[PDB]
Structure formats: structure tokens, C-alpha cells
Amino acid sequence: MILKRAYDVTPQKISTDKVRGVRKRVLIGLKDAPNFVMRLFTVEPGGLIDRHSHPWEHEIFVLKGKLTVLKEQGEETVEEGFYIFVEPNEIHGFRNDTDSEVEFLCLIPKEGGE
Template identity: 55%
Template sequence: MKVSNYLDTKPIQVLAGVVKREVITADDGAPHFCMRVFELEPGSSIPLHSHPWEHEIFVLSGQGVALSEDGAVIVAAGESQRMGGVDKVLALLGGKPVLARTIDVFQNCSSIDQIVVVLSEPNLEPGKQLVAEQGWSKVTDVCAGGRRRQDSVVAGLSRLKNCHWVVIHDGA
């Protein structure tokens, strides 16, 4: 186990107003893990980027915005007119609501960080209940859609927070 103060590590200037300190590296016997502390002066930033591995961000003091890379808007606010009045969003398929099967796919997708579900007004409460029952951690909002599909897409997009990429997908 390594015990140290991050201030004891050598500061490395990486950008104007940005200093990096490498607290844990492969040299410490951690070939698949690293811990770096970035110190940003007010008004400075790190360019938007991504990594093929998981990483955590902790703000030790001050405030900042971390952009979430990818989001999904699941649009299910239609009237199911082609289904003869059967609500396909909450209809069971193999004992599970069709909407739940769709959300499961994005919940289990490693490149999706947040999900917004857009439902018709009558399905809003049952949809929120479904999300609560299933405990999907990536669903950040369930909101009402608009009169047209494009209105529903805009409603969903407006609920995503700081996404770089967004997938729009039908709920059923």
C-alpha cells in the first residue's frame, strides 16, 4: 500500500493553467491503474476528450463541469395508432414491457452514460414507476413528449446534461 500526499509529487505543466500530478503509476506496482490529480486555475479547462477505459473525476475544491460523453433519448410518446389501440410501449413481450427491454439495452451499454425516456402524458406515471421498480441507474429523467415526434425528441434532448454524443431510439 502506498501512502502519500499528492502535493509531494512533481507537478507537470500540461496546458496553460493546468498542472498534473501523477500520484499512482505503473512504477508503484499498479500496471492497470493510475491516479492523477489535475489542478486547474480559474478560467482554464481541459479539452473535451475520451478514453477507452473507465475513469472517475473528483472535484477536491472549487467547482467544475465534467461532460458526460454519450447519452440516449428513448422516444416512446406516440399514440400506438398502428397497433389498433394497444399501447405497445407498456405491452408485455415475454413477460416484460417492451419499453423495459429497450431501456435494458442502453442500461447495459458501456458507452451510454445517461438515458432520458420520453413518454406520452398517459404513460408518464406508469413509466416513472417502471423506472423506479427496475432501478436503472443511467435513467436520469422521464419526461412528457410533444405533439409530434420531433417535439418529443427536443423534449428529451433538453433533459440531457452535457452530452457529447446522443443516440435517439424508439421505445417500442
């Protein structure tokens, strides 16, 4: 059994053609997980995970702030205390239009990697 403060996990900065202003913590990864992995994303002000899709689902819980969710067309903002279920193959992404960091938990089946 592993009991740990999520903040103490070292975040990974992401800056690519499709993801900018985002840090990722792998809390429960491939080393431990028999079936699915647990990540915590921090989206800086102005940060973006552009529209994408994959053959696996997301299960998300918004921990802090106002998260903008990009849909195949349009977008929807949600707050801390929302959960999000993204079906396999659905186009989605994320943006932070606020002036403070947004945090969300994100779980995927292990075929999606960590």
C-alpha cells in the same frame, strides 16, 4: 506500501491545443500500479481540458472547488464531494469558470497510461 502527501508530488504543467491552465500529479503511476493509475489534476481559473474521448473510463472525485464538466452536448457544474464516472468512449472535458483553483482525483485503467 507508499504513504505520501499528494501536494509533494511535483505537478506537471500542461499547455497544448486542447489543454491549458492545468497541472497534473501522477500519485500512483505505471511504476507501481498493477491495474489502474491515480492522478490529481489542478485546474487554474479559466483552465480547460477540451472535449475528447478515449477507449477507457474515468473515475473522478472532486476534491476542491466547482468543476464544470463538458458533455457531448452541454455542460454540468459539480462541487467538491461529487464523484464522476465517465464511461469508455463518452465525450467529456473540464473547465474552471471560478476565481480559485479546482482540484480533482482521476483514475484510469493502466492501458490509458498515467
